[PDB]
Amino acid sequence: VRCTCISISNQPVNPRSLEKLEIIPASQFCPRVEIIATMKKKGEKRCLNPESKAIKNLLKAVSK
């Protein structure tokens, strides 16, 4: 059980900085949200795996 996200985003730079966030259903390997997150805040690209607080906003604010 492990996802494929080199650098995760569970630090101050939570989805509040969110733009191009493609969410996938991680479970079989990683029990979280699989995402290729591009942050609307400073034009940044990252692969997140919601394992935090604001991170919940990741999949919540990205899906709506």
The experimental technique used to determine this model is NMR
For tokens 């029990």, name the residue.
Answer: 31
* Alpha-carbon torsion angle 6, 55, 31, 24, nearest 10: -70
Q: Which two tokens stand for residue 4?
A: 């494929």
| Number of Cβ atoms within 10 Å of the Cβ of 3 | 20
Helix (H, G, I), strand (E, B) or coil at 3: coil
Q: Which two tokens stand for residue 55?
A: 């991170």
- The topology under which CATH files domain 1-64 is OB fold (Dihydrolipoamide Acetyltransferase, E2P) (2.40.50)
Burial of 57 (0-12, 13-18, 19+ CB in 10 A): middle
Angle at 6 between CA 46 and CA 16, to 5 degrees: 25
Q: Where are the domains of the chain?
A: 1-64
Q: Which two tokens stand for residue 22?
A: 């493609």
Q: Which two tokens stand for residue 40?
A: 């609307």
Q: Provide the 8-state DSSP code for 47.
A: E
| The amino acid at 26 | A
